[PDB]
């Protein structure tokens with residue numbers, strides 16, 4: 001039985017705009033399979049462009065928010081989870097806020113000065129490729145000032161577990177660094193997601209600094225590969241990355257266990273920790289082609305499923321099964337959609 005506000009997240013609350021994309025779109029915007037890029041000026045027309053498409057699916061997104069609200073949904077006790085992010089003063093932001101309240105997720109949103117609008121993600125779906133283009137928008141305005149308000153910082157102080165995705169490096173590194181230091185100094189549980197290859201490539205300093213306060217690190221194969229390359233881990237890159245991340249000193253230099261989990265799609269996921277000489281494979285339930293509805297957000301669900309069980313005392317293997325279950329539930333649904341809790345099985 002977990003205390004209220006036991007779990008705290010901060011991140012970028014975003015609206016996902018899911019569209020069946022034509023094949024030209026990927027060439028036109030130079031987009032890649034299973035990837036995400038932050039919108040540059042050359043990308044900006046995509047939002048007006050996909051808005052001309054029918055069958056648009058609008059749904060609340062944001063990597064950290066996805067994970068934290070599913071932890072809340074899984075555990076099913078009201079107000080166990082807390083979330084902080086920055087939205088705009090528009091209908092999109094209000095929809096995202098109402099979605100959180102419907103889930104019994106305690107929030108303290110910062111509202112961006114008008115007319116800065118709530119961030120959005122163009123999620124381009126096709127049989128050939130899936131790809132995301134993110135316009136952070138209001139999420140950038142998330143500040144240390146808002147986080148340090150007595151009524152918001154108190155959510156951080158009461159939490160024993162934190163989840164922050166690497167994506168927040170781009171929006172409020174100062175805040176996530178402050179929370180990370182608070183966690184380590186108080187011997188709490190800080191969970192960190194590598195989130196995307198571009199973070200390890202262009203924000204290497206920030207990723208490695210975050211790892212040094214993280215008790216648990218989540219990643220996927222492409223993130224491990226990009227991380228490995230940037231660190232000169234030429235051979236055996238994915239295994240080497242898992243070992244390297246697990247063994248990085250903590251910021252206070254204190255001897256401590258860090259757990260690293262690298263997912264690999266349909267292939268066995270890898271896990272190890274700093275006390276473990278070996279890297280373990282964990283077999284994953286094989287999916288048929290027709291079973292897969294939408295894998296977008298599966299990694300976010302995986303993290304939620306793992307943490308929700310792990311923080312309630314379930315052993316490593318049991319928690320991994322819970323993580324796969326979470327991801328599988330999301331894979332069989334469109335966008336990060338959480339239905340009635342009774343049907344979770």
Ligand SMILES: Nc1ncnc2c1ncn2[C@@H]1O[C@H](CO)[C@@H](O)[C@H]1O
Pocket residue numbers: 011012014015016036038060061062063064066121132134136167168296297298299300336
């Ligand atoms: N730059 C970003 N920051 C936070 N979340 C993001 C970012 N880009 C994509 N996402 C989210 O990642 C989710 C898929 O893991 C989508 O719901 C999408 O909204």
Ligand SMILES: [Cl-]
Pocket residue numbers: 010011012013062063064065165167168
């Ligand atoms: Cl996020």
